[PDB]
Design a protein around this ligand. Sequence first.
Ligand code: A1JEF
Length: 339
Amino acid sequence: QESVKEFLAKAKEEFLKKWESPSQNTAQLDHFDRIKTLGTGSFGRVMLVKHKETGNHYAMKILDKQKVVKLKQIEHTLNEKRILQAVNFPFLVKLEFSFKDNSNLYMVMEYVPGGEMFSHLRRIGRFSEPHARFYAAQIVLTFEYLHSLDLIYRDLKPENLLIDQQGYIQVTDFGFAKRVKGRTWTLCGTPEYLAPEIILSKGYNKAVDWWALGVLIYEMAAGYPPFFADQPIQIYEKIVSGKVRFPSHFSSDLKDLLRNLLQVDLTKRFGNLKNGVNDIKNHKWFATTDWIAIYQRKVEAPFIPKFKGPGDTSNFDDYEEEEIRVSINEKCGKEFTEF
Ligand SMILES: CN(CCc1ccccc1)C[C@@H]1OC[C@H](N)[C@H]1O
């Protein structure tokens, strides 16, 4: 299909040009006013900030250099910055600035005020199948783009999918994304979403993203994920077992798609066969989807989040507000030379 082939051909050209020549050091901390902490966790902190000269709002991610305990954490944060400054796609949050100082690394991204898909899912209870299909189509197109660049995403989960002013998805957190020619081996990802070959410490590939899409569609349509338990070891036992139970309200087409995405044998899993992403796009559950219309954002969304303005934080939750301290002396300079 030639218009698709040439689209992805140009996508890859434009990615490689930025990949081979990353930008660095494009602002500093005292160019911004701090407003509110939007989240804190294994990813560091994300704060709402306002640019003093333009008045524009941004989401600033702050990483503390000295909390590194493993060399793979350094590699992961360098992956994230280099990939984000090189990609361009309608459903990916855009990186606007990056920089570092004596104590921290900073990635300054567009601010999306509608909140996390996770909050809206837990408030509504479950999404109808048309609503879940609207969000799933956007992830299918995003993985078609990323995989064609030889990138694997490895952190799909509802907390990472923000809802924008038009009710469409923006994917955030490239902390585990990586450029991969064949296989890769790191143990990473949230337990509920891990594919069997990650749990079994095998060399793995882009098929782990299509497994995670199966978990995400099930969770959107049921209201809970297919494999859960109080201990990760119990979660892992269900994931590798080859057994999943579907609610009776699931359509027959939905069950059939999920059995093919949640296929424990990676050589039989949809997205990883000879026809690649088209086994998914041509499946009966997507028969009503206009793929070009979704890409061009011409489809009316299932709902628009309620918010008052580009600086409204009411769709995020409350965290203890802590200092952003920047030591008199530099820490960990060499290890982060490339940032
Ligand atoms: C990339 N790492 C941070 C590495 C690091 C950097 C500096 C210091 C300590 C550690 C975070 C993970 O990315 C995806 C996942 N949602 C999040 O846990």
